[PDB]
Amino acid sequence: RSELTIVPDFYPTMVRNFNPYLATNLRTTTDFIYEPLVVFNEMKGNTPVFRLAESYKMADDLMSVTFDIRKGVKWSDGEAFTADDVVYSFGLLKAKPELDQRGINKWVTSVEKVDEYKVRFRLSEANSNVPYEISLIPIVAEHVWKDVKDPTTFTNENPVGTGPFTVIDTFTPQLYIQCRNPNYWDAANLEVDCLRVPQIANNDQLLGKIVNSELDWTSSFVPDIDRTYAAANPNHHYWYPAAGTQAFMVNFKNPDPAKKEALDNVDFRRAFSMALDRQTIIDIAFYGSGTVNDFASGLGYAFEAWSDEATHKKYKGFNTYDVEGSKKLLAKAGFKDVNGDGFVETPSGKSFELLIQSPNGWTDFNNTVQLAVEQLQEVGIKAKARTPEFAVYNQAMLEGTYDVAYTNYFHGADPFTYWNSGYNSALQSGDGMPRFAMHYFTDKKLDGLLDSFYKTADKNEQLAIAHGIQKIIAENQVTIPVMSGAWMYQYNTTRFTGWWSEENPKGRPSVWAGIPERLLHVLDLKPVK
Ligand SMILES: [Mg+2]
């Protein structure tokens, strides 16, 4: 039989827990045991890939959504998968909200069995993103769990599942083996017979195994990866596609008129952006785990499927390392070294220095700021690194006293989480607001576009909305995007082929729990033997 050796997580020892609703479970439970209704391929525009459902449709008013269940799907014990399972599972999370790890109860007010193979979700808000959120919620077997005395402690050690790997073939403290569902609805597509899951205590133990070609699918940091791993074996590969954006935010409402003269000037923001060497920041501060973000809108290569490439290309030159271009733009904009001290003054002739902050102890951010300070000095922009404690860094943004700040941003499946949290002016005021929108650039058309993004279920309309957002942010160079993080991923072609890669970039490739596309990925693999 073909065994695929995977490492979704580290453990000090294997504890047999396949309850998909508990934080303490094994990280091969979701997707591989409990298959979703739909897997959203987030890298491909968040396009739905229909699995246990064959379709869904939102109501015209976006207040409900129906899913058509695929007929002929079996649980691993042979019983039919039906709407009863979906209704049961959402009812369990409503009754036991400690099992609702994602807070789906906020969005779904009720779930209706329309017929044996159709379920209707009634929603608390007109919101076309709720199908995506629904897709993340594990669906368990009503005919089993109805008999479970306490689902919040149930370890589910003999799981009955819909997904590809439900058979607990081997379970020991050091290793478990999870073998193919003998009733799998998509069995013809599944060529891997079992997941082999070794107990690995830490990243150093993983390193020794991966360089010896003992693993197939991993998602860990590998030091010196090209020399020690990738170049060492023609079967050793990796692919680190772009994840979440990180950027310098500038304070458009800086109280200091000299600093405001610089920061509230689009040519200055573009020159600041051209001074940065993003790839060197990624290589030094982030150990190589990232991708340059050269989108003026911050969209990033994670969401290239959403990009208007005309807009990206028009402003990409302002977000590329270009020392001579940076100096030329500063001069054209009137930022000239008038006193000869090596640094540019504002067009009105005022000296200024930008205080660039990141949180104390966040070493990767701290090193990014220091690198940026040196890069900015090369074009004549006077900057100093500051490392206040997080509460002070955050307060300076909430109160609008900071100059420039380096920050990351929330992760989302589409560009809305980044663009809304990072730019909606409604998030610049109020009790409890986080830092992410506190550049104090305001555009009410931008706000309206964001507020409309999930008020349509038409993807062509959403793409048009995204393109309008992208244009507004890019043409104003609102922030200075630096980099995108990495979906960490290494793969071995010794025993299997079909892997996703830069040459075959079919989706997010990581093996982590929480990556629904790992189900699609394992269905593309083929044993060499
Ligand atoms: Mg000067």
Author numbering: 1 to 529
Study text:
We solved the structure of unliganded protein (open form) at 1.6 Å, a higher resolution than the VcCBP structures formerly deposited (2.2–2.3 Å resolution). The unliganded form exhibited the largest motion (RMSD, 0.8 nm) of the entire protein molecule, while the motions of the individual domains remained at lower levels (RMSD, 0.1–0.3 nm). This clearly indicated a domain motion, in which the individual domains did not change their own conformations but changed their relative arrangement. In unliganded VcCBP, essential subspaces were widely extended as compared with the liganded VcBP (eigenvector1/eigenvector, -7 ~ 15 nm/-22 ~ 9 nm) revealing a large conformational change from the open state to the closed state. In unliganded VcCBP, strong self-positive correlations (red) were found in the region of residue No. 1-239, which corresponds to Upper1 + Upper2 domains, and also in residue No. 350-440, which includes amino acid residues interacting with the ligand from Lower domain. However, strong inter-negative correlations (blue) were found between 1 and 239 (Upper1 + Upper2) and 350–440 (the interacting region of Lower domain). Furthermore, inter-correlations between 140 and 239 (inner Upper1) and 1–35 (N-terminal Upper1) were rather positive (red). It was clear that Upper1 and Upper2 domains move unitedly in the unliganded state, but that these two domains move independently in the (GlcNAc)3-liganded state.
Periplasmic solute-binding proteins (SBPs) specific for chitooligosaccharides, (GlcNAc)n (n = 2, 3, 4, 5 and 6), are involved in the uptake of chitinous nutrients and the negative control of chitin signal transduction in Vibrios. Here we propose three-domain mechanism of the (GlcNAc)n translocation based on experiments using a recombinant VcCBP, SBP specific for (GlcNAc)n from Vibrio cholerae. X-ray crystal structures of unliganded or (GlcNAc)3-liganded VcCBP solved at 1.2–1.6 Å revealed three distinct domains, the Upper1, Upper2 and Lower domains for this protein. Based on the crystal structures and molecular dynamics simulation, we here propose that the three domains, Upper1, Upper2, and Lower domains, which correspond to domains I, II, and III, respectively, are required to explain the translocation process of (GlcNAc)2 by CBP.
